[PDB]
Amino acid sequence: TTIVGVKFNNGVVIAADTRSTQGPIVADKNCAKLHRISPKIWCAGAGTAADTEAVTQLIGSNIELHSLYTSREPRVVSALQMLKQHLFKYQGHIGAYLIVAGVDPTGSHLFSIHAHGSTDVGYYLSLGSGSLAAMAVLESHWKQDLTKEEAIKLASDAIQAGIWNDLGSGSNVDVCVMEIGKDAEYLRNYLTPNVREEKQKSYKFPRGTTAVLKESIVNICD
Amino acid sequence: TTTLAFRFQGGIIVAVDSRATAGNWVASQTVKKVIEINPFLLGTMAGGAADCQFWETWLGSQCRLHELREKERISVAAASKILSNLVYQYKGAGLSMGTMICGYTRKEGPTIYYVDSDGTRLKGDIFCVGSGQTFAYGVLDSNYKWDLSVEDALYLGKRSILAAAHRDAYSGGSVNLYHVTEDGWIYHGNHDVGELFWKVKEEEGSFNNVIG
Amino acid sequence: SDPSSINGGIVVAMTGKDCVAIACDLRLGSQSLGVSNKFEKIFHYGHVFLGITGLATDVTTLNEMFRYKTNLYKLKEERAIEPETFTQLVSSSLYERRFGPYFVGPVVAGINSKSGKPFIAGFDLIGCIDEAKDFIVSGTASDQLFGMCESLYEPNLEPEDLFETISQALLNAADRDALSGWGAVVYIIKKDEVVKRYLKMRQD
Amino acid sequence: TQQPIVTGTSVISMKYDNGVIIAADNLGSYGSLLRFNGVERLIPVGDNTVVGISGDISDMQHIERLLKDLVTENAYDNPLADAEEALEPSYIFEYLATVMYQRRSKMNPLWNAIIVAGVQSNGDQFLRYVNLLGVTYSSPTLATGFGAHMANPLLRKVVDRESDIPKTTVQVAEEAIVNAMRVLYYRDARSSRNFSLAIIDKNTGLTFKKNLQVENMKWDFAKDIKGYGTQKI
Amino acid sequence: MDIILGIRVQDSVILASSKAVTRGISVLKDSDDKTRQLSPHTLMSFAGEAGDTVQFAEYIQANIQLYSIREDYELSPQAVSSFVRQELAKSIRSRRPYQVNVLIGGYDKKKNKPELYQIDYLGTKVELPYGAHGYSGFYTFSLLDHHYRPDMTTEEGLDLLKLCVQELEKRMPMDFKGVIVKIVDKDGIRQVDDFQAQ
Amino acid sequence: MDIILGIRVQDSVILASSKAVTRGISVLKDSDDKTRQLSPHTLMSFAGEAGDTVQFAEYIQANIQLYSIREDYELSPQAVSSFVRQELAKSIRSRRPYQVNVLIGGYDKKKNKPELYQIDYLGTKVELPYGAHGYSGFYTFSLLDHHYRPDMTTEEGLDLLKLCVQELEKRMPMDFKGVIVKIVDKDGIRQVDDFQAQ
Amino acid sequence: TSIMAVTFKDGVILGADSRTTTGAYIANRVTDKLTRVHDKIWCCRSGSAADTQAIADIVQYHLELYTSQYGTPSTETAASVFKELCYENKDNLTAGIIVAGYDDKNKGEVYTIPLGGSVHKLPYAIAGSGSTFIYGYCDKNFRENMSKEETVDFIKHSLSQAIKWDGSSGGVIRMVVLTAAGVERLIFYPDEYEQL
Amino acid sequence: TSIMAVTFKDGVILGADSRTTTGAYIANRVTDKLTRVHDKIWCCRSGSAADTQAIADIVQYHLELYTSQYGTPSTETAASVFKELCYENKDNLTAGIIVAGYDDKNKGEVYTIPLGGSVHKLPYAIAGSGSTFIYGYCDKNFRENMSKEETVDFIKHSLSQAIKWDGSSGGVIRMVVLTAAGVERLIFYPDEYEQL
Amino acid sequence: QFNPYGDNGGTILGIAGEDFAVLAGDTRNITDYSINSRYEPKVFDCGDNIVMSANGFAADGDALVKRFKNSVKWYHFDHNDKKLSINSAARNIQHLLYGKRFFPYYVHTIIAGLDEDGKGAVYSFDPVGSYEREQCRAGGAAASLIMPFLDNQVNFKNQYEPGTNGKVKKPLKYLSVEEVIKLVRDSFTSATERHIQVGDGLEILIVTKDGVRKEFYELKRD
Numbered sequence A: 001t002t003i004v005g006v007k008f009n010n011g012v013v014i015a016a017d018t019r020s021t022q023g024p025i026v027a028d029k030n031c032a033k034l035h036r037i038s039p040k041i042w043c044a045g046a047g048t049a050a051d052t053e054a055v056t057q058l059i060g061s062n063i064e065l066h067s068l069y070t071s072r073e074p075r076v077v078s079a080l081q082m083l084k085q086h087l088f089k090y091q092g093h094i095g096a097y098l099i100v101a102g103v104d105p106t107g108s109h110l111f112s113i114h115a116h117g118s119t120d121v122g123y124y125l126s127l128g129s130g131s132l133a134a135m136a137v138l139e140s141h142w143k144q145d146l147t148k149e150e151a152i153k154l155a156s157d158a159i160q161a162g163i164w165n166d167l168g169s170g171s172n173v174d175v176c177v178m179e180i181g182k183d184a185e186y187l188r189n190y191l192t193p194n195v196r197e198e199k200q201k202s203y204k205f206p207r208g209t210t211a212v213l214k215e216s217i218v219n220i221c222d
Numbered sequence B: 001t002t003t004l005a006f007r008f009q010g011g012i013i014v015a016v017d018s019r020a021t022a023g024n025w026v027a028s029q030t031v032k033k034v035i036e037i038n039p040f041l042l043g044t045m046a047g048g049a050a051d052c053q054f055w056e057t058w059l060g061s062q063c064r065l066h067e068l069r070e071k072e073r074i075s076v077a078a079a080s081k082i083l084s085n086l087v088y089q090y091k092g093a094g095l096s097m098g099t100m101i102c103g104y105t106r107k108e109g110p111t112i113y114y115v116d117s118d119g120t121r122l123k124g125d126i127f128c129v130g131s132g133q134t135f136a137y138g139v140l141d142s143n144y145k146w147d148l149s150v151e152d153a154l155y156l157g158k159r160s161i162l163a164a165a166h167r168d169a170y171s172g173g174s175v176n177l178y179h180v181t182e183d184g185w186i187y188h189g190n191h192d193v194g195e196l197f198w199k200v201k202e203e204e205g206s207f208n209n210v211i212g
Numbered sequence C: 001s002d003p004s005s006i007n008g009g010i011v012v013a014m015t016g017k018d019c020v021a022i023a024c025d026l027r028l029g030s031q032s033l034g035v036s037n038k039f040e041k042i043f044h045y046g047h048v049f050l051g052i053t054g055l056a057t058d059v060t061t062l063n064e065m066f067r068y069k070t071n072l073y074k075l076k077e078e079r080a081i082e083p084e085t086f087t088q089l090v091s092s093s094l095y096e097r098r099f100g101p102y103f104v105g106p107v108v109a110g111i112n113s114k115s116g117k118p119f120i121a122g123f124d125l126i127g128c129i130d131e132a133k134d135f136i137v138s139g140t141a142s143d144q145l146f147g148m149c150e151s152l153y154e155p156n157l158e159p160e161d162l163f164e165t166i167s168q169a170l171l172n173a174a175d176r177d178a179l180s181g182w183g184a185v186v187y188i189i190k191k192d193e194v195v196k197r198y199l200k201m202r203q204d
Numbered sequence D: 001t002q003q004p005i006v007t008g009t010s011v012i013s014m015k016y017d018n019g020v021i022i023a024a025d026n027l028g029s030y031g032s033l034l035r036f037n038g039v040e041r042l043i044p045v046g047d048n049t050v051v052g053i054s055g056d057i058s059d060m061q062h063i064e065r066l067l068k069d070l071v072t073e074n075a076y077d078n079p080l081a082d083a084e085e086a087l088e089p090s091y092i093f094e095y096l097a098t099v100m101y102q103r104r105s106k107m108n109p110l111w112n113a114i115i116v117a118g119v120q121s122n123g124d125q126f127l128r129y130v131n132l133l134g135v136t137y138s139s140p141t142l143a144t145g146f147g148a149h150m151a152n153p154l155l156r157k158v159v160d161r162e163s164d165i166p167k168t169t170v171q172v173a174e175e176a177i178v179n180a181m182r183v184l185y186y187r188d189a190r191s192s193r194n195f196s197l198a199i200i201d202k203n204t205g206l207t208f209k210k211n212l213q214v215e216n217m218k219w220d221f222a223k224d225i226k227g228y229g230t231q232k233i
Numbered sequence E, F: 001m002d003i004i005l006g007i008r009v010q011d012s013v014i015l016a017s018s019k020a021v022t023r024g025i026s027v028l029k030d031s032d033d034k035t036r037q038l039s040p041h042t043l044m045s046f047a048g049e050a051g052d053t054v055q056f057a058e059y060i061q062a063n064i065q066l067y068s069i070r071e072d073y074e075l076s077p078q079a080v081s082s083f084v085r086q087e088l089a090k091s092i093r094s095r096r097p098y099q100v101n102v103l104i105g106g107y108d109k110k111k112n113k114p115e116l117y118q119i120d121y122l123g124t125k126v127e128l129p130y131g132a133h134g135y136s137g138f139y140t141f142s143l144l145d146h147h148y149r150p151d152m153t154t155e156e157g158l159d160l161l162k163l164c165v166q167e168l169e170k171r172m173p174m175d176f177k178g179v180i181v182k183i184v185d186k187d188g189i190r191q192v193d194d195f196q197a198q
Numbered sequence G, H: 001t002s003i004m005a006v007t008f009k010d011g012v013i014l015g016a017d018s019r020t021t022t023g024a025y026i027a028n029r030v031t032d033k034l035t036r037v038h039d040k041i042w043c044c045r046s047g048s049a050a051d052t053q054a055i056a057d058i059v060q061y062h063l064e065l066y067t068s069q070y071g072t073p074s075t076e077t078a079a080s081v082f083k084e085l086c087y088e089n090k091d092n093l094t095a096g097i098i099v100a101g102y103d104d105k106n107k108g109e110v111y112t113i114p115l116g117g118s119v120h121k122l123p124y125a126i127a128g129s130g131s132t133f134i135y136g137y138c139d140k141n142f143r144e145n146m147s148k149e150e151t152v153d154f155i156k157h158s159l160s161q162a163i164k165w166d167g168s169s170g171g172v173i174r175m176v177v178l179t180a181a182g183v184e185r186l187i188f189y190p191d192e193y194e195q196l
Numbered sequence I: 001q002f003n004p005y006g007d008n009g010g011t012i013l014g015i016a017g018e019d020f021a022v023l024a025g026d027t028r029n030i031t032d033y034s035i036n037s038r039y040e041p042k043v044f045d046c047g048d049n050i051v052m053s054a055n056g057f058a059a060d061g062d063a064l065v066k067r068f069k070n071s072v073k074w075y076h077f078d079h080n081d082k083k084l085s086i087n088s089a090a091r092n093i094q095h096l097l098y099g100k101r102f103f104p105y106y107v108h109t110i111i112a113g114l115d116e117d118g119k120g121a122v123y124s125f126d127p128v129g130s131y132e133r134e135q136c137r138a139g140g141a142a143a144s145l146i147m148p149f150l151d152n153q154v155n156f157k158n159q160y161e162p163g164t165n166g167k168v169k170k171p172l173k174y175l176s177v178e179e180v181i182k183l184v185r186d187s188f189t190s191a192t193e194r195h196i197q198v199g200d201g202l203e204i205l206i207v208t209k210d211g212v213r214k215e216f217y218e219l220k221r222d
């Protein structure tokens, strides 16, 4: 997995690759790794995939209830505090490593969270196996006061470095842009530089190739 | 792996499966588990494939060397003992083999020796060896008689390997069949389990655990 | 002695043109010993199909659990559960046991009775959803199944063609795994009708 | 059975149109102590080859002694020792790869990752890696340790395949190397600000640069960072 | 290693269970009955860990008898075997699991069919024409695969088991001191108390 | 576990050895003669690790036969056992020790006395009226402590032995498939071919 | 990590490097290790980042509740709250904290809480993996009652030596100045402190 | 153990504490850690006492034989013999040695051979468990071409700090001065150096 | 503790035709989650119209190929330039492998050429020297992905004649070089899709009664 977060002058962007693995086998060639906590707080995870998902939904649930209760827009520091206290209580056993980003009435925010429950604040971050390849690109090209366009490009190049150079990462680039102005824009399959080439042959079988022992119609209703 | 050999009225029946496994991975379904040492001598293979292949091929060399030296074919007793003594040198190093040496000589008659990597060497009338041994034993022992015709004995051999091929996850592929006489092994063909199972079910009325 | 390996078992599911297919082997073993030739790994709650590989006791228990839960769903909602929804129920039920998991590889297959579109899903033992639309594989021959499917599959196969593709994928994967095989059943699922077929295969 | 004691981090390298570039910092670490600061980890052999070594420094010093003995020994009874029968990069490499693999096979490895860089007598670039396992490979870009994770991705953005190599100048290649050394100093806890760099060009020969430093570092953005989540001041 | 065998013929189920009880270097008993009657038409046989074995059987027995008296009705073999399965499947994840394997042989009077269920300590249940637990299955499964027919009489079933026992007395390392054989049919449960020296 | 018994009566030594060879879950053979004749008036029985057992026996046999031919004379039982003990005592400290326990029964022609030696794999030697290796001694030593008399005939000894084998068949957890019985006296070694139903 | 707190004439200064590592990878090069638990009570954290963040947060909460009920807490009181948490949970925690605070009655104070959860009031304290390398230097150069410019230099020099020898230390040097005046944040860059 | 060697204008000086421990017990409070292997080539030993003595004895034998055949060995030659023994036997040795020597040509030289068996030429070196505490101090206070008295002061101050913080260091500070003069043994007692 | 072994990835595939053989392998070389090189051949012309690959731990792979090529050299010296036939090469490689029975070469090895009668031949080995001649074989990391596909598409396993009720098997026929190469490319694009250690490039060696021919195809680089 490669996930990044990049702060630009009017907001924050997150990007991720789209390969999930079972050991050395690619299970899903195009899974979405960008999860939503609330409309304008988005989240990318690495580590145990069931954990990043579940922790995101649980905190997302509680954030919504909080927002209804308080009549206020959810704040990123709230997702952070809820996430870190939950993760900490579980002493690492919930293997969720997250880059959390969003905009709220107090501005734009970028954080990372580790499985044991530590957090850091940054202008640019990366997590996952492709983390080092991504950071190499970020440390080479990041600057203060990036524009929305420059930030989308930087984040995308960094995920790409992951796709090419990290074996645990591949396929496509998903992006989400959160600007202090408007809505968040989720940009599914922003890049698709890994299309399976046309096969050399069809493997469609002549009907009746497979030997059958016995057959029956299965009933559904009542 | 399942291998067997038994003595009866009309010589020796030798039957083996042909599956190679590495863990739960089926490495091959068409492997040769009998080595034709000379026209009167057979060796079977179970355990480590390399260990078996290598040392029984080596055994053939030693048997041939005996023929040139003594101007006579090696006995079953002596051939088995060469392999037995070699394997004993290596004891505890982790060789893994279960083996039968089957043959005919004038002096001995038809003879079966079981040899394994622990160093055990036994002369006997009936042996099943490999992960499928108990399954082969179940059918073989319950239908065995000294006076079985050649035709029936070859069938019992074939059917015992099929039994083990069916129940043991680590056995299967095909049956390779041999008959050893005074004159002296004769090959009785390769029998693919894919066809043999259905053929035997139909003709015999057995395998009633199997649906369809 | 790893629980996902004691019993053996494979399940594969595929989408085609306005249809889904889900297939499984019939073996129930204990290590090397084949025990039963008739152990089916596919179940169905209304028009929703669930295939389960792994530890057989958990396979039985999960089916009995999802029968239970979908019965109650049907009673309160006054309609049958849909595939997208059942997938979420499977996921959260498995995550509920995060630290003492069921040792299973569940697979969901069905057509949405409202939108009419084919749906398949896979899970790991703690409920992480694999959301592939082409195919989903599970069990001790999963590696082999991945290889068969990636090579043999193409999108938009008619029910009769999809039958051949999924059957051949299953059969050839099973024959390269010691703990799978001993029979197979294929469900062809079309909105309107479902055909169940027993395959003829190597019995070793 | 053994374990590295005093160690030296990444060695990074790439091919350009007319030769090869290789660099390594000047640090010998003692676990997490940055113990020694004037350590040369680039070793010229003759004047067509530079051997770059990471890992255990005592083993590095042993490999130095071997390479010097190799030059002496090649010169013996050899009137073409500075011409047609001079040591070639490929000879130096195969030799080390033999040593490395023999030592791992005896369960007594030289605890190193090595990159041999140079130019053959037919003008061809030579770039090859060997390590403590005797694993060997070649690529338009090679890096050891952290360099493999962070330098390669940046270097590969310049030379992604064989056909990118006529297209790459000395200046662009050196620029990319120097930048990658900066990134390593940002993110590698065992790296140093000071490094050596060597260019082996088919026309220029050997240029060995010592006492280079990482420059143009970005640190100003640090001042805006407060706390670890909620803290404002 | 305790022999627990089951064979379902056309009109009955036959259970054969080894008589030996061995601790360490001593055979303590040569006449143990590894069987509890669960109801007039349902019999259970068991093998496994020394204490767990009888405690489980008797706990199951008490529960089924309770059900009978509460409803004045006999549960079907299918119903009994589902109860047993769930109990074992609960046990496997508790603090100390019952280490017990079972065969359940019953005659279903509503269907007029004999039924044989095999369930291991994990709660793995399956219905079979013949079954076994432990090592003995490694011999008998292949044997029965050959000699078994779906429509055998009870007398043919008993000849089939004789073959199974004989094979085990030839190839099994341990002395299990013969078997106790019991038949479950339409009439109930009786003991062929003359199998060991027949 | 491998039954190895010896008893010394007044005019003979009787060796009895179990006939089973068991590997894993299968009895591979039920007619195994766990014995080698070392010289016309000395017999050795053995039990232990699978390969070592026969290899040691045959090696010893070779050495005694070599002595006999070199000297044209038969070593006394005491001498053979001393030589056997030495070999085992060297073995225990070598790279891979022979894991073999033996009994040695001889008729000494120079003294006109039967002699029974028990030697374990460590090279522990003792001359005994009766002996056993393995678990079998846990039954037979006490039985013979009760039943044995120093003035018994060969027929009395065979009865005493029958009693030992009955007890082991009754109490031992393993099926050892009966015994091969050999008598050593002045007229040499002979096998009692009838014991499984004498 | 290299952390330190130094009492002086007008109060106390806290200083830290900015490097966080996992193994040999610098996970964060611009970390802020100076943690506010009250207006003029700050701490430095070493050990498990999770454990020290969870602790500092609980302490922040405790002092906020204290202030609402009882007025500003003293630095000792803040140190006592840290100690209760570290001592009572010592088995589950890898936490080494230096507490520092300014107060009008007490002026500048420094308390160190090492691993076991013992408390020690000191004129200055040093902790983290980097601190081993500067025991000699600091013991030789510290004086009581230094001026603000002198203490900054003492911390600047000490931390730059720690950074030079400890691989787990590095980045920028951060300081917090705590006096009657207020709270002042300082930062010093590699090009500045490497020269010293 | 705290050991060091420092080059200066006229030669080289070696210093060491005199404490040897087994656990927390001081087995010897007056050890002589400064070992002569040739007239003007000395070393300080750290690690296993058995190992370093056995090594120093073998080196002394090699240098005596060297002197018989070829004349005075250079300090580099001494250091190379130590390395050979330490490198080639790295798997049964726990030895860290500092070699210090004077000859007329090369003047004063220092080599350090840490655990791995690597060799490092340095203007000054510090080793032993006590040295970790004085990396900051030594780096800040060492200058090249110091006078005898300045160097004596630098070692005295450095080792007094190493002694102050390291439990495995202590006793008396011994020194050997190596110049053209001359070999000079110096000793300093706790009552002097603690008051620094 | 020193681990004398590692894993370099990589997959290899060998198919025998009637009068030709192919041996294919990807050109990627990996360590853990990193890529060492995108083009590092692991299939070799060994002389005498024999090609070889030993895939797994590359250092053991190269050692073995080197040692075998040296056998071929010495076979010529000692037996008057006699051609080393494929069956003899196989046997020889068994002794090379079994010689290290107690410290094995961690490679799955495949050789391909033509037999005495000019029929295509493929021999494959386990790490310790066990061998068999086969019509086809996949080895290395994606072996379990490709082997079943070959059983189905080379030996027509599980395929029946339509309408025969699964009573008549699909008849076995030799495939052409064009059809074999199609299966090879398709096998590798499949393996590349689903295995993270497989990709970058494909090199195929084809052997006929005129020498050894080479073909190269780009593979996906993620």
Ligand SMILES: Cc1ccccc1CNC(=O)[C@H](Cc1ccncc1)NC(=O)[C@H](CC(=O)NCC(C)(C)C)NC(=O)C(=O)c1c[nH]c2ccccc12
Pocket (backbone or CB within 6 Å): B001, B019, B020, B021, B022, B023, B027, B028, B031, B032, B033, B045, B046, B047, B048, B049, B050, B052, B053, B096, I104, I124, I125, I126, I127, I128, I130, I131, I132
């Ligand atoms: C006696 C016989 C003779 C000829 C043919 C088949 C048989 C039946 N026997 C088997 O099938 C055994 C089963 C067994 C497995 C593990 N233990 C003991 C027994 N398999 C093996 O010995 C396999 C054989 C294999 O995979 N051969 C490759 C080939 C010739 C089928 C292409 N090798 C391997 O699994 C193997 O080499 C290894 C697998 N992983 C390894 C890691 C390091 C070193 C070696 C190996």
Ligand SMILES: [Mg+2]
Pocket (backbone or CB within 6 Å): B164, B165, B166, B167, B168, B169, B170, B171, B172, C203, C204
């Ligand atoms: Mg089978």
Ligand SMILES: [Mg+2]
Pocket (backbone or CB within 6 Å): H162, H163, H164, H165, H166, H167, H168, H169, H170
């Ligand atoms: Mg002290």
Ligand SMILES: [Mg+2]
Pocket (backbone or CB within 6 Å): I083, I084, I085, I086, I087, I088
């Ligand atoms: Mg030839």
Ligand SMILES: [Mg+2]
Pocket (backbone or CB within 6 Å): I191, I192, I193, I194, I195, I196, I197, I198, I199, I222
């Ligand atoms: Mg790939």
